[model samples]
Target: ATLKVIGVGGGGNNAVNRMIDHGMNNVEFIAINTDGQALNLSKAESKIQIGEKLTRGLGAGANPEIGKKAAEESREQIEDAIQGADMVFVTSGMGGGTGTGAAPVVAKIAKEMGALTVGVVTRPFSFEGRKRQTQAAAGVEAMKAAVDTLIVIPNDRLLDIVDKSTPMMEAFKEADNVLRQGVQGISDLIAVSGEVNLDFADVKTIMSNQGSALMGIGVSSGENRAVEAAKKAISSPLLETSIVGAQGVLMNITGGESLSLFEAQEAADIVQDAADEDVNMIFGTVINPELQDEIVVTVIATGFDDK
Candidate 1:
């Protein structure tokens, strides 16, 4: 399947840039923006300057209405960027001009052209106050109709595990990396070849129309790496709620040549013990030689009592 990644507006654009902070060329990356300068600075493989004449590249990020109009005005380019994609991921932060309004528009267009679209978004921090957070909810709520699976990171809650004593900049950086990790976690689960492989259908079965899914990645090394990594994944602070009730799960375990079959089973069993018995659990095992003594456990859970 042809996989495409789109970053809409400023926040969305940043998400796409963050995604390519390293090399991941198997997928097409597109950045859609209303600001000419901002669009030009983007690191995506392709860029779309929405409302070039209408906004004159000034970046109409002050309100959602202007963001919506910019997208409509640039429909021809949007369609061209997403052409022939089998699956597309729309990444962004809400309460901003472009992403709040344009991400849904972009996702809708991807779907219309027969692509399965997933939206990975971040809500404003609590310190940002009630107004922005409330606005973010509305924008995120609007995305349910457009995306097949929605993974939202409550920027505030995502930092629950971070040390409060860290530098303020460090705190914000954690949240920034979370988005990249969230998208990368999903990408690795299906994109890379594994000992026990998973296809797009396997992940789609766990994510399709499953609103507000949860995702996390944990890594560890040592004598007891299996249980230790699983423990971290189960207690991942990304989701405020527990994964106990999730109806389905997609878990991928990656370890070096040192990993053994028994260790892999032990790690997944820990997750099984934490979740409901009926959970439709899907698992994949990948070997990365560079990870000599380390192991990574990635999990995405769905069918929660979401908002």
Candidate 2:
């Protein structure tokens, strides 16, 4: 399946660049911004400057309304960029003009083009003040309405994962790296049609269910690869929630020819134990040729009551 990872606005573009730096090259990358200068700095495969006539490439100046209008004015270009994608991942930082306004608009356009739209966004830290927090909340709501599944990682949560003395810029960069891994997990699952293919249909079945989704990824090598990867995936900080009540799960395991049915069962058993007895499970496997007892497991848990 063809996948397009798009970054909207300035923060979004930076995140995309970080993803590329982390060696995410399976999917196509596109950067959209209202600022021509910022777009020039991004390293995505495709770059689009929106609201050229309206913003004159200066940016939206933190006004979401102008950001939205800019996207509306550039709908044709946006549509052309996202055209023919089987799955589209939209990432951005909320509480700012381009990210807040253009993200939802971009997701809506992708959905209109018949793609499975997933949005991964970051909310502001408490130090940024209440106004931005409110703006982020509003942006989240708008994005939720536009995308099929939304994954929000708050910047404040970075404190829980990093040292207090870490510089603010570095902290944000770390957060961007975390988001990159999450996107890579999903991309890995979709890009390869494993030996026991999960395919887009299976993913759609789970994500199409009611509620938001959480993705967890884990990699392990050497002895008992499946069990270790499964355990790590379940405990990944990216999940940040109990899987006890999840309605459905889509699990993809990628490994070499060394992967056996027992190993697959072991991985599935671990996930099943953490989930409710009635939870729906879909499993997929890809026999990667380039492997020496290495296994990568990606778990996408969806359909929670508390959206």
Candidate 3:
């Protein structure tokens, strides 16, 4: 599948740089921002600076209304950037101006273009204040309606992943990794030809079938790798809480040629154990000649009730 990832605002642009630093392959990154200095800092393959007259490259100044106006001014450019993409992933940090306002607009454009749109966004931390959190909540609602799938990471969740003394940048980087893993898992499932073949249409089918979705990924090596990976994925912090009542799941197993049918069954069985009542599931596998005895599993769970 032809994939494009658009990063909106400062936080989103930073995450895009981290993904590039980690060497994400077979994907294109575009950094869109109202801050020209921040846009220059982004190492994305393409860059767009919006609101030249409105903000004069200064940024949205934490004002969502200005962010919306800026994006509206650059509507044509945003439409052109996403052209010819089979899938588009919009990543942003909510609570702020541009990300909170422009992300939904960009996502809506991609959806209008008939591409499967996914949103990866971060909610504000408690220290960022209640007003920002309220703004972010509104942004999430708008993005949920605009994209086929929406994965939200609360900034508070980062506390669980890192120590109290950890620097702010490190915590944000770790959060970015979670987003990268989610993006990579989906990209791999669509890009790599599996023995059973999970295509772009399959992803669209499941994502469009549900409201919001959660994805978990795990990898394990050596004997019993498939089962181990499955277990890890089920218990992953990324999805442990999100998977409780998911209505549907699609698990993709990628392993070496040495993988056995029994191992595949074991992985599927584990996912079945994790799913809730009335949930539907499907599985596929990819054989990698270079994968020695290692196995990687990606589980995408969808359909959560509104909270």
Q: Which residue pairs clash within candidate 3? A: none
Q: lDDT of each model, Cα atoms only? A: 0.79, 0.82, 0.83
Residue-level lDDT of model 3, residues 155-195, one tens digit each, is: 88887888768998888887787678877877878777889
* lDDT at position 200, candidate 2: 75
Off by over 4 Å in 2: 165-170, 209-211, 222-225, 236-242, 257-260, 305-307
Ranked by lDDT, top first: 3, 2, 1
lDDT, model 2: 0.82
Q: Could you tell me which 10 consecutive residues in candidate 2 have the lowest summed lDDT?
A: 234-243
- Full ranking by TM-score: 3, 2, 1
Error of 1 at 77 (Å): 1.2
lDDT (Cα, 0-100) at 271 in candidate 1: 83
What TM-score does prediction 3 earn? 0.94
Better of 2 and 3 by lDDT: 3
Q: List the residue pairs that clash in candidate 2.
A: 194-286
